Amino acid sequence: AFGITTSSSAYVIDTNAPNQLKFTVSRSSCDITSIIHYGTELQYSSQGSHIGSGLGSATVTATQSGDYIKVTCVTDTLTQYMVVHNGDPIIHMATYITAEPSIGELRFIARLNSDLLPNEEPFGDVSTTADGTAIEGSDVFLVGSETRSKFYSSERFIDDQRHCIAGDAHRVCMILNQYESSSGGPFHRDINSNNGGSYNALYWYMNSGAVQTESYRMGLHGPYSMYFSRSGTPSTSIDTSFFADLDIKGYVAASGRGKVAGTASGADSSMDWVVHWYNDAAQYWTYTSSSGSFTSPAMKPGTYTMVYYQGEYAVATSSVTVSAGSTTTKNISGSVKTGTTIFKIGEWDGQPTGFRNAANQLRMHPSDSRMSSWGPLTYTVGSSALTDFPMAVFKSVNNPVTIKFTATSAQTGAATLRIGTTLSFAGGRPQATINSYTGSAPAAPTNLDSRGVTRGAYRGLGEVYDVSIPSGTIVAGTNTITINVISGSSGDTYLSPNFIFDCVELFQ
Ligand SMILES: [Ca+2]
Numbered sequence: 001a002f003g004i005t006t007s008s009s010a011y012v013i014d015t016n017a018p019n020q021l022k023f024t025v026s027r028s029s030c031d032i033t034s035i036i037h038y039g040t041e042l043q044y045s046s047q048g049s050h051i052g053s054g055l056g057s058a059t060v061t062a063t064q065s066g067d068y069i070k071v072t073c074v075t076d077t078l079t080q081y082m083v084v085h086n087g088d089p090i091i092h093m094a095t096y097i098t099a100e101p102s103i104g105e106l107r108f109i110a111r112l113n114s115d116l117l118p119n120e121e122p123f124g125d126v127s128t129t130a131d132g133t134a135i136e137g138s139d140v141f142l143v144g145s146e147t148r149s150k151f152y153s154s155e156r157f158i159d160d161q162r163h164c165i166a167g168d169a170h171r172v173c174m175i176l177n178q179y180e181s182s183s184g185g186p187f188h189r190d191i192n193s194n195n196g197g198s199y200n201a202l203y204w205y206m207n208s209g210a211v212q213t214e215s216y217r218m219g220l221h222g223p224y225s226m227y228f229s230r231s232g233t234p235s236t237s238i239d240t241s242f243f244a245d246l247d248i249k250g251y252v253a254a255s256g257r258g259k260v261a262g263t264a265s266g267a268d269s270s271m272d273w274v275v276h277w278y279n280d281a282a283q284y285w286t287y288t289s290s291s292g293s294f295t296s297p298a299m300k301p302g303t304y305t306m307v308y309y310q311g312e313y314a315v316a317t318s319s320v321t322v323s324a325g326s327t328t329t330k331n332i333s334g335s336v337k338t339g340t341t342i343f344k345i346g347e348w349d350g351q352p353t354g355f356r357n358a359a360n361q362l363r364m365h366p367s368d369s370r371m372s373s374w375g376p377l378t379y380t381v382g383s384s385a386l387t388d389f390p391m392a393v394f395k396s397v398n399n400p401v402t403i404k405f406t407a408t409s410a411q412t413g414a415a416t417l418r419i420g421t422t423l424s425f426a427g428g429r430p431q432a433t434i435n436s437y438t439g440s441a442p443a444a445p446t447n448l449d450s451r452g453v454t455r456g457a458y459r460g461l462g463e464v465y466d467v468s469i470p471s472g473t474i475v476a477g478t479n480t481i482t483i484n485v486i487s488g489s490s491g492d493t494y495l496s497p498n499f500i501f502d503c504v505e506l507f508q
Contacts, residue, residue, distance in 0.1 A: 052103055
């Protein structure tokens with residue numbers, strides 16, 4: 001029957017789902033200590049499913065409100081909610097914070113039976129580290145001859161509405177339709193799952209320090225839903241609007257929200273367009289249609305910075321104000337401006353898309369034998385393919401990158417060499433030499449204080465470095481460009497100072 005079973009140590013919640021879903025919440029810690037789906041225990045026995053590594057101690061209450069059950073867990077700076085609806089095999093959750101947890105990240109981890117749930121979806125065993133020997137920190141491993149990491153399960157938050165772990169008789173999915181209180185914008189990615197040897201972890205990283213570009217946000221994180229299936233795959237269309245009737249701290253209902261609608265125009269039509277709204281309280285995003293038409297998600301009232309991207313490259317920024325119950329009409333327009341192009345390597349999309357090893361880097365370590373050679377490589381304009389240009393240059397692996405190009409007599413005037421990047425590590429930035437002319441050494445970029453390129457990430461501050469080339473420095477015939485990564489810092493192989501390329505363009 002739908003309801004709550006009370007004992008001194010626990011509340012047992014029965015969702016009354018057709019294929020059965022019951023779970024046990026500790027009244028001492030708020031740990032989920034047992035999960036019964038279709039007559040089968042799914043919870044790892046030695047450690048609970050919980051926020052972080054566990055709340056430790058919490059004040060736990062459980063109440064039925066019509067066809068809903070709410071479990072509330074109160075600590076000093078965090079309130080954890082679990083909500084179920086009669087008939088649905090779902091544990092709906094939301095996490096209210098007034099301060100960032102001590103550890104400096106905010107996550108929910110489900111530690112589940114890896115014999116019953118061995119697989120990870122949608123990316124497969126790239127994040128399966130079971131039987132692995134560590135090759136970097138405590139988070140990148142070699143399993144046989146293949147490099148593996150929990151980070152290789154990651155996906156851009158804009159595209160991460162569902163990820164799962166699964167077996168032949170059970171599937172458990174996170175359904176994530178509310179990233180408003182997260183950090184780092186639409187293109188932030190984070191740890192999704194990890195079959196690590198003792199159990200298979202299913203995550204939602206609400207926020208973290210992994211390649212983090214923004215301050216953390218307080219208030220209500222989520223809702224988020226953990227769906228339990230036999231062999232079905234749940235739709236991401238899951239109503240959580242009933243949260244409005246449960247006195248959930250920090251919850252703002254549809255009625256307390258407004259929208260921004262309009263048309264974006266002017267950017268590169270060969271790329272997907274994204275519009276992004278943010279302030280200290282909340283962040284929102286949407287893809288536009290091919291015509292540039294967009295409507296924001298339902299937004300908390302206030303004033304927002306508004307950004308228009310082609311791919312992940314920002315072409316325009318504006319400001320907009322949102323009021324509850326109202327749609328603000330606001331257009332946005334912009335384009336990437338350079339000049340008369342001599343050569344262009346890559347595209348202005350804020351990504352290393354198309355570069356050597358770019359596709360592999362999302363799902364394996366740079367040291368993996370399946371990677372193509374990092375270099376040092378010589379790229380020759382008009383002969384080399386884009387997949388012959390390294391997605392990243394490391395001070396102590398493939399430094400420097402050499403570019404050969406042909407110029408006509410008409411192209412010997414003044415020019416700008418533009419070196420667009422996505423993400424730096426350990427102070428890495430380019431210094432360029434063109435023939436016998438050496439550009440200035442740019443200062444160190446802002447340190448993001450985390451690994452990235454070795455953990456399937458690339459979305460940084462997107463620093464762009466221009467080098468002014470005087471007239472008569474470019475010559476008719478063959479020219480040589482050398483791109484060195486410089487930094488006062490040092491490291492072994494892929495942990496040496498480095499940056500990931502976005503685009504390299506020479507224009508006049
Ligand atoms: Ca690019």
